[PDB]
Symmetry: D2
Subunit: 380 residues, 4 copies
């Protein structure tokens, strides 16, 4: 019924055999056959399929309103499997500010295999239409993007992909299935770095993929079985377990996001704030039409590098570390941590200023997170 | 010093911090930074590096007399990472009877990316020399191969690769580092399905890669970080743990292999037997010169399909299942389980007869395994 | 600061060595010593202390505002360790409706060792004063109790224990440290079945104990080390992880409890409802004075056994299983599942009627849980 | 059939449901019931029974030729459960040099509950007969003992216990079920610290108990369920896994023990050597009649404390740490590490000299262990 109930009872996460109310961890590589070719329950070799992995795959398929789920050893392994749907000579359109690991995989690995890529500003969907080439086979978008939270119209992107015969893919990591369901808007494939919100506890590296398309599912299953970037059973178990609290965690994060943004907008040491909930944000209306909540990632400008470092030092409840979607609130400086290889003038031109700070809001008390960040900003 | 000591004390498998005598399991995705860019112990994000994974990587590097180790989510993920060292238009030479997953990955995935492959009979190394093209960049060999245990001269293959500027790769799964060390014979990269003997307990799917070449190591690290087929920490821990007993397990397996082969050769219901320890086996001398023991995989002919099925039913201690390298002895019929998609006449021409049985010798009592297989053969 | 922040940042749950943001799992039994008697970080043998167990012990000590925490292999192991503080000939006062496992341990195990027990109605604290004997050494109370949710005044019980030289113990399982903190009210020892709300995911059996008393802590540490009912490292890790979401889970449970009770009170197929939030409940005022929220356990009367069974069959979101504090809502019938060995007339006299149903409210959507239970009651 | 086969195929360690060739890890606390009281596979609450724990219990019952197995959170938890078979006023006879944890539990915990104990020299079994009191209910023996490896006649002890109506218990930790089977010699209960050889990898703390007596089994099951010192599922899994290699590990250890003892006896810096394989050892004949191999624990005298410390520093392959039965060879000095609270003159009188060294032989290469210990002794 409602989303919080679906998180508990969606998918198959009990043991039919013993009745165990949690998915058993099948730390196993192979399975007895009673006769050659007769599999007791469809399992024969864990790379091909493992029952704990099947459980997390059923969860992500259910939560995204798809039919087929796939669990990979990381988000970028999920992305690589999806890119491997294509052949040498095929072309992919992606948003211009796609995640750095995705950018790196495409431009330093897959271009060596003849995959062609163009990174365009998908905030206007006619930019996609202009970029379509005779060889284009795939449209891959994140929304909202990192670290400036640019929003792309999913429904229109799906319509463009359908009209031009493209496989459409949405990286739905930042929004999670709790708030945004691209398959419902006509997208072919949705994927996640489950390392972030889905696992939710900073203790699993994993990717998840869902689709309703039987033929794309067969192709993905073949790629997974052949290149072997599969998620192990312990990590699959911890994912199922973490997803149980996704709704509660995202709702707490959203209450905190709203209050933190109010504070940041009022504070004299903060300039521009980047988040899709802000009414003047580009494509705010599009976001509200395709999602019923918000990501916990916020970026905002302070004056310079020294102010950013001092802000980090002065907080009590914001933890300096990579990743996002923890139960802890995390803080980082993209110019120093993710975009340091880009020349400084190009960083500034892209809006990645020396003082741009990114926070990933966690599940601490809202008043504490607001007050802590405010008092730290007061020291600037 | 000696091999059994190196298995216990080689690599770094204790905790410098607490002194724990086993590697802690770092079920974690990210790491506190005390200042931006200052990593306490070199860790920042588990896809890039995880301390439990670093432990198993140090073990495989030590055991293969290499400098750098890499742990992947499966054997075929290790193989795919190694193939991704190449570009569209590059060519690979492999032995003609390479593992089916390797064959499938190369001919159904990587050929779509412009990688070219030729499968040649490497039991005569001049066949490699003839197959070298202007575009050849890699030589990839297993020895002994599956299921007929063909032997390829590693030292000569390394010399050919060096002379022609090829990256040389040995899939050393069947022999393990306990008996065969390709890096010592001049090979650039050695890899394993750790799913088999190294883990040894049929409870981890994993791949391991080692090299002494700093530049190839940098390229592999970049591929691993970018396509993300990494082994998780629980599976890394179970690998380290299983490798502890590798020497004892392989030695027991070898005692049993010798006695079982004597029995099979004497038995009137068995025709040809395939194993490198047999003195009339092709390249027996080459194998003994490059290895100081034997694989536990043996293939042998009984009369027909019905005899193979009856043999399987009549044994008490041979378990019908996929994979090899378990503590249990495993039994299978390649024509029905691995080569069933090949036409029957081509199977027969290749020696994969309907009655060809493959056993993976486990660590049960030698007398029991011999007597059990003999009494089952007596029912034919 | 506030409770939700303390749940994330209270205790020591990161790795000082690598900076890992989660507690490493020390699957280890012993620790290197650099010189005889010099422990690198205070660890020497995991029964005595294990770093992952130390982490969960620091969490429960912090959350209960104590100084010392102890992790046991189950709730009843924690209870047994606490009872072992006493000697043959000593006497314990407990509430009359204490948990069945506690009742069984005391009356079938510890009475064989000369421990004497009396079970009295502690809802009037002068009943405790009357029951005190010259040999009484301990007062052990749960509040609220199972399955009728009787409330005992903790502060007055602590005052009585102090005046009469008794060790006071509160089993705080049903309320959790998020809502009720007995050590702050003067109680000597607080304990939990962490199997329930603290772990929160029905996947760990564990007990936790906290105290501020250095001498009682030394005695408990000695008992734990000598009788060895210690929690293992994987279960300790899963406890730390589950406790992260305790605040969010308990708050969702409480919203649902309030609405479900309104529904039950209005429904013509339901008679008496048992929960401390109901204003006519005995010691409602005491509960509100010693707790700032509610347990998710509710009991209520339907007509008879057949109605209870039909209610269970008609629900979609209530799961028939033992235990409480899951993310799933659980349902049970005490007369058939926990009190079936008590004669029927004595059950009825105690209020455990054939139609008494117990629910443990989970974290599903509030509207779904209310509507589901209501429509199931409509079928009666 | 033979012991090495029984280690692989004895007990139930596969999944009947999926066919998984290893025991699934049931990280779960409770189980769905299809109707009230109908358990799908006999499971209802993990403290009472858990399927992974049931697997390790079936293994230890099979290996000891018993009917019922029990898995506890530590060796001393197993011992405490067995002692709890008795009542206040009952008396236990034990060997005089019983393990320090056992001594401590009995004399500092269970004597407070009215259990009476006498520690007698059981190397002459008529000492047991003299010590029997009207209140004696239990005879508890280790053989061989620590650290001087005293041997007690198991068969005669069982006969004495039967004649006098005593429960007989053997702590079989040092010998393991691979070499010594007390239940076959008439003993009622056998127990192990599975922390040592059975797990074998220094990564699980656990106890195991086996019996053939249905009534004692019912009593132990009740004690386990009521005091809750149960082994968790991950540790149960790691035990099953470690036991697979018990035979290979013990046989390697025994080859090394024989050669090391030869070296120690020949070395001028070593005085007395303590091990049951030495023909002049008291009850050598008894040991050979009740066991078909040897423990890996050896004690031997060097001159003084400084020589012992120097010996430890000079070895490369002997690790200073607590516990025994690792894959690593371990070394310790009882006078400083286990018996330091005993006065020095009483230590000397008992044979625990300042120079007494204890080694636990691991599975490193035999020649390396002999040569390393010899060269270290040469520095004295
Ligand atoms: O602001 C963006 O443009 C952006 C941010 C991210 C997220 N992100 C997380 C870690 C990280 C590391 C490196 C980078 C990049 C360098 C670079 C250069 C050209 C084009 C692109 Cl897309 C990129 S990305 C981005 C990273 N993705 N795009
Ligand atoms: O006897 C061989 O030729 C051989 C055996 C294996 C091992 N193996 C394990 C599982 C499995 C599954 C399928 C197959 C194959 C079908 C096929 C067709 C043409 C060329 C090749 Cl190489 C192959 S392999 C082989 C498999 N690899 N090669
Ligand atoms: O309503 C109560 O009196 C009550 C309920 C519980 C909780 N509970 C959970 C599982 C369970 C199993 C058995 C029983 C009991 C039988 C019995 C007989 C005399 C005195 C007492 Cl205390 C008890 S308890 C209680 C159980 N504890 N007390
Ligand atoms: O040589 C023995 O007498 C002996 C050694 C062990 C094994 N052991 C392992 C760790 C450890 C720690 C303390 C002690 C003890 C102090 C003591 C005092 C009186 C009687 C006894 Cl029995 C004991 S034992 C023994 C320990 N058990 N007995
Ligand atoms: C409500 C519910 C669904 C249906 O979800 P929709 O968002 O309406 O498509 C599926 N599964 C479970 C377990 C549910 O409770
Ligand atoms: C002996 C030993 C080595 C050296 O191994 P080689 O096979 O001689 O290269 C390395 N590490 C450890 C721990 C050893 O014991
Ligand atoms: C606020 C806070 C505390 C203090 O908790 P009190 O309930 O005020 O005693 C302790 N630890 C952490 C991490 C906190 O955030
Ligand atoms: C041989 C065997 C047994 C019988 O063991 P005994 O020592 O003869 O009592 C039991 N189980 C298995 C699996 C065996 O192989
Ligand atoms: Na479900
Ligand atoms: Na669609
Ligand atoms: Na501002
Ligand atoms: Na080492
Ligand atoms: Na080289
Ligand atoms: Na033959
Ligand atoms: Na903390
Ligand atoms: Na106090
Ligand atoms: Na009512
Ligand atoms: Na078995
Ligand atoms: Na008997
Ligand atoms: Na000597």
């Amino acid at each position: 019924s409602n989303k919080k109930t679906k998180l508990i009872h969606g998918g198959h996460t009990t043991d039919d055999y013993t009745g165990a109310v949690t998915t058993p961890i099948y730390q196993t590589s192979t399975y007895l056959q009673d006769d050659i070719g007769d599999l007791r329950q469809g399992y024969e070799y864990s790379r091909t399929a493992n029952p704990t992995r099947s459980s997390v795959e059923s969860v992500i398929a259910t939560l995204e309103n798809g039919k087929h789920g796939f669990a990979f050893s990381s988000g970028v392994a999920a992305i690589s499997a999806v890119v491997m749907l294509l052949d040498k000579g095929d072309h992919i359109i992606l948003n211009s500010d796609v995640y750095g690991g995705t950018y790196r995989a495409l431009t330093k690995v897959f271009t060596r295999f003849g995959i062609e890529v163009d990174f365009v500003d998908t905030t206007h969907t006619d930019s996609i239409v202009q970029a379509i080439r005779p060889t284009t086979k795939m449209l891959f978008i994140e929304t909202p993007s990192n670290p400036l939270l640019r929003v792309t119209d999913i429904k229109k992107s799906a319509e463009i992909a359908k009209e031009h015969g493209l496989i459409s893919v949405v990286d739905n990591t930042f929004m999670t299935p709790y708030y945004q369901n691209p398959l419902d808007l006509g997208i072919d494939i949705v994927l996640h770095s489950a390392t972030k919100y889905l696992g939710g506890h900073s203790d699993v590296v994993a990717g998840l993929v869902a689709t309703s398309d039987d033929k794309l599912a067969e192709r993905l299953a073949f790629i997974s079985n052949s290149t072997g970037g599969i998620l192990g059973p312990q990590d699959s178990y911890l994912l199922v377990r973490g997803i149980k609290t996704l709704g509660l965690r995202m709702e707490q994060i959203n209450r905190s996001v709203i209050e933190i943004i109010k504070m940041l907008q009022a504070h004299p040491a903060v300039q521009q704030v980047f988040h899709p909930s802000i009414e003047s944000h580009l494509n705010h209306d599009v976001h509200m039409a395709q999602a019923d909540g918000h990501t916990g990632v916020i970026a905002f400008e302070v004056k310079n590098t020294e102010s950013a470092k001092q802000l980090i030092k002065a907080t009590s409840y914001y933890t300096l570390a990579e990743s996002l979607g923890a139960v802890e609130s995390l803080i980082s400086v993209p110019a120093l941590m993710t975009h340091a290889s880009i020349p400084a003038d190009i960083r500034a031109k892209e809006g990645i200023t020396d003082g741009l700070v990114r926070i990933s809001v966690g599940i601490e008390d809202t008043e504490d997170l607001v007050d802590d960040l405010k008092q730290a900003l007061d020291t600037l």
